[PDB]
């Protein structure tokens, strides 16, 4: 089906919408955020993540994103600089990580590997900071190259 696949991921800056290689995420940590504009818990969870970056600035924030319309992404992409991925029907990621409801926040090892498939209601607690980082001190990464250096379609696709 797919040539290439997830080549590009976007996010708003300075009032403009922009694209970055899939690529960059390579090797990094990442939070998947399964969301929606039209969402009043997604909404209100922004301001979790916003306190988790703060404390966990090296994991890569990426939306993926269950609006109804373009217009409705790309009004959350502004108000939150994530970045995201690109405006689409993603219910089979939903379906691969057997995704219950919205918002969901999965923490993700730079081999693609889960470390916490539950991240939304961890982080919903406000007493796991301390006890996360040690989990992530102590979990030994193991590299994973992928081809163009392009993770998703492992991440993402089966």
């Known amino acids: 089906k797919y040539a290439n696949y997830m080549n590009?991921?976007?996010?708003?800056?300075?009032?403009?919408?922009?694209?970055?290689?899939?690529?960059?995420?390579?090797?990094?940590?990442?939070?998947?955020?399964?969301?929606?504009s039209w969402?009043?818990?997604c909404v209100t969870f922004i301001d979790s993540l916003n306190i988790f970056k703060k404390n966990f600035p090296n994991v890569e924030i990426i939306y993926i994103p269950?609006?109804?319309?373009?217009?409705?992404?790309?009004?959350?992409?502004?108000?939150?600089?994530?970045?995201?991925?690109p405006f689409d029907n993603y219910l089979y990621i939903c379906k691969k990580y057997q995704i219950k409801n919205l918002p969901s926040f999965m923490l993700i090892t730079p081999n693609n590997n889960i470390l916490v498939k539950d991240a939304a209601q961890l982080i919903k607690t406000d007493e796991y900071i301390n006890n996360l980082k040690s989990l992530i001190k102590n979990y030994i990464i193991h590299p994973k190259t992928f081809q163009f250096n392009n993770?998703?379609?492992?991440?993402f696709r089966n």
């Open 39 to 41: 969402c009043k818990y």
């Open 66 to 85: 269950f609006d109804r319309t373009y217009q409705e992404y790309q009004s959350f992409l502004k108000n939150t600089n994530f970045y995201a991925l």
């Open 151 to 155: 993770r998703f379609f492992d991440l």
């Open 8 to 36: 590009y991921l976007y996010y708003y800056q300075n009032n403009e919408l922009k694209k970055i290689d899939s690529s960059y995420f390579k090797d990094k940590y990442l939070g998947l955020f399964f969301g929606a």
